Design a protein around this ligand. Structure first.
Ligand code: VLY
Ligand code: VLY
Ligand code: CL
Ligand code: CL
Ligand code: CL
Ligand code: CL
Ligand code: YB
Ligand code: YB
Ligand code: YB
Ligand code: YB
Ligand code: YB
Ligand code: YB
Ligand code: YB
Ligand code: YB
Lengths: 494, 494, 494, 494
């Protein structure tokens, strides 16, 4: 079932959230938030800058002090607070899904059934880890008792993207809080609204003040203050590889803060001749077109064995011609707008390069509508490796389909990129499934599927698609700092 | 027993090591290597620069290719090769300890009994992990089989310091090789010799070509080529916090390579009134003066409770006046030289600041001898927190002793530094031992001891003393890259 | 705050629970359930026997079949069902605490504040593990892909004691269900009632039918049917060491089912001269007298250093004379009855042996009241090692206090028992705390405390106090069965 | 290459090994050891009985005492001793392989290339774990510091089978010693000799006295003394399911010692129509006929899809007719004798049942030669599920081949046994490989292979094929005993 909000959405939370209270910006300035489907202003939000980030860090630092409620409470109680927060997001699911759709240009069906479900499920997963984070006792050489503490790191600056505002907010704060950190969150300038509603729920759930602080504002100002801050211990960022480089540089230049990055991709699929063809067509299609192509895992290079290539292209094109564009709140609509002008312009520019560089336009290839940042769903066949559409992350509804005849070569071509977020392998051959997935230089390899993401799995990039992993058991390591304690004793025994 | 080499040391290995063969530098240039005890040139070594680092990376990359001997061999066989290398270092222990002492200005007794023992033991520990590096199978939501591979990362650039050339070489290459990486090692410009001997043993042990490549040369040239290299996947560096910042910046600027850093410290000890006094005096003394103070963990701020402060200072000063300075090869000598002019000048400058800023000079405080970079063992009492000798890493035989009356305050003072490598707590109180060690912002906290390092423990800094951990179970994580493989199935069962 | 049930308790659930429905016994027989405070019959309950256990196993086996809802549901959803069950127990906390107090002779204050809190907390802990149970991927020798599945074992027969009916029900079913097993629970003949209420909540929460089956009845009939059953995969039992031996024998004789046992103890405390005396007196007192002494961890031998022995005995005796005996539902009452006649008779017999064998009776030593199985709180000093009260588990409010002068000897005396459930060490000496706790042959050693139990810790006996551990990360291993899957491939890569 | 011993084998070690010295039996009795290929007596060996087991346990107990060399030595040094033992077995490989072949009736080629290689490799694997056995630090509720120690269990009685004397000796002692236990080993009455040679190497390697004690003798006497012993903490047994039941009973009856069992099987293979046929034929053939069929994993029921059944039977029969029977020391011989008369008689009896119950004899079916316990390699087709040869472990060179048409049904038939050691699945279908292996109730499932065993994998049975696992990370758990230490503190921090 797909239920809907019965009254119109009223925007309430538009301020900076520090020590569980609502703050005007230090400057007093505010910035507009827009609906990408209408190009109309929804509201104004307080514009946080370096001075506001500074207030947030002081609050996070104080909440992190030895003897504070957040440091001293039972790990099980940090878990309890996270599960309570998940219950509250579940209570406000209609409200949050509507706001997410309206602000983010995100199909409401997906916002409600996928984004909100994933947000609730990830929080509950993270809640479960809280009192299961454990160090070791270690049989060191000599007469010593050695143990380790897996402590929280401290204050964690977290910069959230616009493409999955709620999901990414929870992917950041869930593990950080489960491990006992305090956070300073900087939601995307395009999509601050749902994060600020979640802040109200953090207060309601009973988190101690300063444990979660949310400073909306811009990248170059608030994001650059977080990255260069001398008392932020760690920064996590999801976004473009370009900005990831600048984050990593500012961390090294300032206080050597720990850095994790989830960045873009140019993720390949390899479709062997023996693949289940309609399954491969459907998953590759959804793999590239999901959320108007605005996924870092977008399956933006599809390599198909020559003998099934024409049939793959044909089936793919017919699937791509079945969309209904429009406002993402209207039922039956199956493709919303792109997030803003900058992204819209980038996508159209890259579509034009595909045309100019000699790719075969199968469908789409231009804008749509009288308002909103809409781009027609586009398919290119006969794509070659030095084309811009084969090398650059488009972040739009633009599919590239390529042929191959040699498996050795297509693996090289798949790996011949500075990216490495994910990949897809489609085959009925057991040996090929295992050997190809082993050889691909990508963080997640899907076999006979694509875009399957769950809280129980680690997720992140090889190469310039990122540093570190999120979620799973393994992701939690990056929100702890290991302390070794070695105690002199008279005599040890095994 | 302390055995010695029966014939004089002959230097054999002075060339760049790539694909298990000895290479002249591309330029043809060579650089001098000196003995810090005599200031005399021992030999010339080939000067590697960006062009040589480029050759080494290509060799490491080729050895890392899917289907290569190093990728395809049993994990147990990578372990076997490491244990064989440890056996060979054990065979050449006299030779290596002598060379280490001669080149590094390191007391031979310590070089033989500690450095070489630690080198052999760490390698054997690392060898044991090789076929115990494991991913997971994960009960993901939905009908999927999900597993993870903990793969080697790939080509790892490793920059080794001059203070423990052999130990640090093994701390880098042992875990990297155990996990299946290939390496490009850049030993310190001051101490290339023992690394090049180990390279000959890597060949003898039977490691495939290109798995370990060693390029001697300078920091600004060879180190900056490694840090900015577009096909190096990871960089590990031990050294000054200053250079660590530049490494982290160059990694972000170039290819977002993974970075681990073990950097300096200003490590504190807290000595409570109830402490075993002579134990605390002895460990704090060795904690600061070991290897002419040239340890990143140097216990360079010693806080002592007021009532035992005078007695602690008295006992410490008498311990510090018992050294015999001279050539580190002569038996009975108990303090060698500093490594070079740059470090020598820095130490004397900081000693002069202590005098000028009003610290109480208890002993030492000047140079020694007619040749060699010797500094008298120096003790300052009545040190205050804004003195240069309390804030800056000296990296010399210079002890600082401070008084405290409040435990709350001394913990704040201990933590009031951008460093955080290690710390010492001396007390008979169980509760104090546990609570103080928990509250200290340091990677290793010793209780009633100091400088106890073993292969089974993770080791590394909080804050600007580093990123990541070395050794232990936990250290091995940073030499793997996690890949998630998610396979569509018809029906899963628990 | 201590809230109470506003109306009188009405007993509703008195039947056998199979496939989420209420069953009469196959024979049609029923057995009486009593209140140990009044000796009055509360109700009748259906008497399950081998024929009913057989029906329960068939139901558990069917729920465990490949393709069943319980096998195929997301691990996260097994977790969700457990957290929902915890919410329901929390909703019915007053009801359950009252029933537990009334049926079990358990102080209501403790039943509400401790037992019910522990029950809710343990379930929530277990819920968190459900989708965090993971196998491995393993770098086996040769060209193979090897992974492991940590599968549920299957049908688990679980025999629950009368002393903590609710807590022990949850300690059994929580981990078993989290791991994906199905269960056949056999609550104590004395205390079936709270388990049957929880069964109604298992139905309400939405667990699939047959996942949890509860067969009340006697030990020799229903317990012996479970232990000897040919299609029960595992048996877990908490109870006397005597019956544990019979369970282990019947498992070996029948189908080699896996066995875990948590059995009795004769747990020692060692109180050194430097101990915080009133802390040691208070914890040792609570350690032996908690729940009328009916805890397997009862601190039933207290060894005190000679110089503080007289003062320890004095303070202990005055603490023991402060109880108010009576109905465990009346506020202000601080000691309830023993569970039944058999236990009552055993306790009085052992008290008489202490008198006859020459122990010094400090207080108590006889029965109390006109009805209920009440025993005066009793303290013996000058206890020696060959007395019955020093060797045999009393399971009653009977404290034994002994002197020692040698630490070597008292450790030997502490370890000189076939039991080994737990122990207590009281000292201010760091070295003694670590070395004594290492040397004691006991599963849980408390330092400067006693009886501190939490869901995050493994718990179980050394020697004849048990096989296996419950709770913690480690406890979950015993509710999985490891399957290795090794797949031939053409070429492996690291 | 296959090198051979240059002089004839001389038997040296024939005595009981206690405290690293050679002991006559207490009775003075000795028992004969035979060559199964000639039926000739090789030597006499001291017959250990309960009195000798008692001496061994006292020695093991003393070596296990707190403060002993084995308890106090570095974990890394226990590892060193194991790697040294592996080096010594490698030195004596020719000698040991020859003795193993001669005493065990085991093909020399296999004894040298497989058994000895596996023995050396498993020891080296186990050596690596020694200083990697670690407990935890745990964020318990309340103000406590909680850690766990993964201690050795203590004295471990280990009963070794005759089919792989050396491999099984090492599978037992390697993990037990790595974890810090002491052992009392009881090699098979048929094959004591190689174990006693290894005992001499344990002395040479420098293991402390009493750490390894070896008591040769019979099952009903020495094995029953170990199983019922009141001061043996754990028993591990590999052998028949029949004796496993008696071990488990005697453990429960005596001191509740921990029990692990690796018992027989009736392991199935499922060969789907799409399988690589010659690969499936070859692996299934080796799966049943390896070491004269005397493997607990013997692939003794082969289910083949109807359409390829006739061709599978044909190819299997031709493979089975290619053996050369004779003395296992003669090169070119490819099938040795069975171990003794009891096993020989059992095999022939079961072959006769196959004939009488209506199975189709394809080849073999009788004895061979004038001396030695030789049985012709035998193949039965058209085997049905209620035949003795389909239900009972034969432990001989006797292959059973069955047809199936339904996959649902053949899985039920495969699982319809009280055994569950291992299984084989042969298919090219990815989904079938994963789903069938998940559904099979067996400890190891091989996919497109069979009998692939390595030290890095856990190994053991489901159901009546065993309790617990050996080797791998998971196997090491069963040689530790977990102790929780919970320390009261003033205030905890995360
Ligand atoms: C909503 C999903 S995430 C998710 N689902 C997707 C994508 C493309 N197609 N689909 C169906 C995608 O790119 N993400 C995503 C991945 C990483 C970071 C952010 C978003 C989820 C699932 C389980 C738990 C939480 C979130
Ligand atoms: C030689 C030791 S390391 C070692 N031993 C020391 C130090 C100061 N006093 N002492 C006795 C010290 O700073 N290091 C060290 C620590 C980290 C990196 C490099 C060196 C060792 C021990 C065990 C295994 C390997 C190496
Ligand atoms: Cl993982
Ligand atoms: Cl750790
Ligand atoms: Cl544990
Ligand atoms: Cl495992
Ligand atoms: Yb299909
Ligand atoms: Yb427009
Ligand atoms: Yb002392
Ligand atoms: Yb000079
Ligand atoms: Yb006190
Ligand atoms: Yb009575
Ligand atoms: Yb083939
Ligand atoms: Yb014969």
């Amino acid at each position: 079932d797909l239920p809907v909000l019965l009254t119109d959405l009223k925007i309430q939370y538009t301020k900076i959230f520090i020590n569980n209270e609502w703050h005007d910006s230090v400057s007093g300035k505010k910035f507009p938030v827009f609906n990408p489907a209408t190009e109309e202003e929804l509201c104004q939000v307080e514009e946080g800058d370096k001075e506001d980030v500074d207030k947030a860090v002081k609050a996070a630092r104080q909440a992190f002090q030895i003897g504070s409620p957040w440091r001293t409470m039972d790990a099980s109680e940090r878990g309890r607070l996270l599960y309570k927060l998940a219950d509250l997001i579940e209570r406000d699911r209609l409200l949050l899904a509507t706001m997410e759709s309206m602000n983010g240009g995100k199909l409401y069906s997906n916002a409600y059934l996928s984004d909100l479900a994933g947000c609730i499920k990830t929080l509950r997963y993270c809640a479960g880890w809280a009192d299961k984070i454990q160090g070791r006792t270690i049989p060191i050489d000599g007469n010593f008792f050695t143990y380790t503490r897996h402590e929280p790191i401290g204050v964690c600056g977290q910069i959230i993207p616009w493409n999955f505002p709620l999901v990414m907010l929870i992917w950041k704060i869930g593990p950080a809080l489960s491990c006992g950190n305090t956070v300073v969150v900087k939601p995307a300038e395009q999509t601050p609204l749902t994060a600020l509603h979640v802040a109200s729920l953090i207060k309601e759930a009973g988190f101690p003040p300063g444990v979660v602080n949310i400073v909306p504002g811009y990248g170059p100002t608030a994001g650059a203050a977080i990255s260069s801050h001398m008392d932020i211990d760690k920064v996590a960022f999801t976004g473009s590889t370009e900005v990831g480089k600048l984050i990593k540089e500012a961390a090294g230049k300032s206080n050597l803060k720990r850095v994790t990055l989830e960045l873009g991709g140019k993720s390949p699929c390899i479709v062997l001749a023996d693949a289940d063809l309609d399954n491969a067509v459907e998953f590759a299609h959804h793999g590239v077109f999901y959320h108007q192509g605005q996924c870092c895992i977008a399956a933006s290079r599809i390599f198909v064995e020559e003998s099934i290539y024409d049939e793959f292209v044909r089936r793919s094109v017919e699937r791509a011609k079945k969309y209904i564009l429009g406002n993402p709140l209207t039922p039956g609509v199956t493709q919303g707008p792109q997030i803003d002008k900058e992204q819209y312009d980038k996508i159209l520019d890259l579509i034009e390069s595909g045309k100019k560089e000699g790719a075969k336009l199968e469908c789409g290839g231009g804008p749509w509508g009288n308002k909103g940042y809409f781009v027609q769903p586009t398919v290119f066949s006969n794509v070659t490796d030095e084309m811009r559409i084969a090398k650059e992350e488009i972040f739009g509804p633009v599919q590239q389909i390529m042929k191959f005849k040699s498996l050795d070569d297509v693996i090289k071509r798949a790996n011949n990129t500075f990216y490495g977020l994910s990949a897809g392998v489609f085959t009925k051959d057991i040996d090929k499934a295992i050997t190809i997935s082993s050889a691909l230089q990508a963080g997640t390899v899907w076999v006979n599927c694509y875009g399957v993401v769950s809280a129980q799995c680690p997720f992140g990039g090889f190469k310039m698609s990122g540093n570190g992993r999120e979620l799973g058991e393994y992701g939690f390591h990056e929100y702890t700092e290991v302390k070794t304690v070695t105690v002199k004793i008279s005599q040890k025994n095994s």
